[PDB]
Symmetry: C3
Subunit: 195 residues, 3 copies
């Protein structure tokens, strides 16, 4: 289960970085770099702060997952410059809800306290997109009007509450990922903003 | 003593990040993120390079300190968009002088050599503001005309000299923080620049 | 041999950062900061991810090497604002080819797998320039039309192939650095781009 959620979150963040590079008409190598930065960005910061081995260093198959996602994005998509902005936000939304819960879960079971685990979950979910946006000189997600970081904090905090209610990790994460994803997708499809 | 200087430097850097978010009319969650990035930014890089536990991971009360400073900045201040720029510089100035000395002191007593300890002190003082400025697409402090990094290098180097003269840490840091703060505040109140 | 290649790559990356600061007419302290960020940027990320001591923390003479390169750039060059852009690219090109091979070699002999070692080599070669470019609000190298990251991936991958063919490290790195440097210099002197 966890094995499949990590790969899916990595493919998803690599897809958002690969699409972002397609807007700039970059060559395939620039696409792989921008896709790799978004895929591992939040995870590397999370593992380093936790003093634990980095996930793609400990398991090199993540790198082949990123390269495969970037290469498929290059060949399967004709004109990436005219790609709609909704597909980029939906991509960043999936990895945001996933890694916000997985990051909190991984930190909690590594000994991190409750508030530290939630913070490390939000870092895993938003840091990869923040580095991607500053490299392309684009306004980061947290500075836009739509709800963003609230969805990340919601996923990690809901996992802690369900974990405290003695739910198993599988049911606690599924509800936490769905609640974080529903709030972010609603803020994208309906442009919901907070004052 | 050290316990109170760390909290004050964290409140101060969190205040500068919270005020910066107020200029962009961000929601409370975007304010907490930008305040947290500035508060822990330099400290996290310092502890990671030192291969020591991160301060807010080892002591979660720093996170509650950041959240309390960010929330108070949201409710106690009416219109943050029209806030004067002097209060932002004074905020960044306090955390700059504090963490430049505390970072050097923490590194030196963890086994870091003299030049490494001073470099780690300047990193602790300026890195948090650098990440805050690039996220908001604002020119970083080091690229502006007023004296900035010199005040950081001055605080850490003065601590080493006073420590070599067999001053206790309390008196060595108080003079080092004041000398670094006086130079930066003078460069803000009188716009002093270096050719 | 390795001792001389590390110093040369550090001097070279510190030179590119010092020249970049000269365009903005920064004071000497802002020059040292920007030169230090470019010199250690890729190396610090490489060592941190590898859970190994940072090179300039373990050996403080790198810091004196950076400060000496930055100071010499300040005094030996009259007008740095009118410095040609070719000298900046050639500077970043030398450190790119060097650290892409040295980073892969250092990671491989520290236990990192083949794909992890190559990724860590490319990170060591491009991360320092990426941080330098975003601080100055300049378009990063990977977003430009000329060949860049391909030269970094080429140096690290060629080292692995020659290492697999039972070449000693000295001959494997010399060919790997030259092949990566020739591709990048050709893309600078002739403005070669990839579609």
């Amino acid at each position: 289960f966890l094995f499949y959620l990590d790969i899916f979150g990595v493919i998803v963040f690599a897809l958002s970085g690969a699409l972002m590079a397609g807007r700039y008409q970059l060559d395939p190598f620039g696409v792989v770099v921008l896709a790799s930065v978004t895929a591992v960005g939040g995870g590397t910061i999370r593992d380093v702060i936790l003093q634990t081995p980095v996930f793609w260093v400990e398991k090199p198959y993540y790198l082949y997952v990123i390269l495969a996602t970037a290469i498929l994005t290059i060949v399967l998509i004709r004109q990436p410059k005219r790609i709609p902005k909704r597909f980029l936000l939906i991509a960043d939304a999936l990895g945001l809800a996933l890694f916000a819960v997985l990051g909190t879960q991984k930190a909690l079971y590594l000994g991190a306290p409750i508030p530290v685990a939630v913070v490390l979950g939000t870092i895993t979910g938003i840091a990869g997109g923040m580095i991607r946006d500053v490299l392309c000189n684009v306004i980061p997600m947290i500075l836009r009007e739509e709800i963003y970081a609230l969805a990340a904090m919601l996923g990690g905090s809901l996992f802690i509450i369900l974990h405290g209610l003695n739910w198993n990790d599988t049911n606690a994460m599924i509800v936490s990922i769905s609640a974080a994803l529903a709030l972010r997708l609603a803020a994208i499809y309906w442009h919901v903003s907070l004052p």
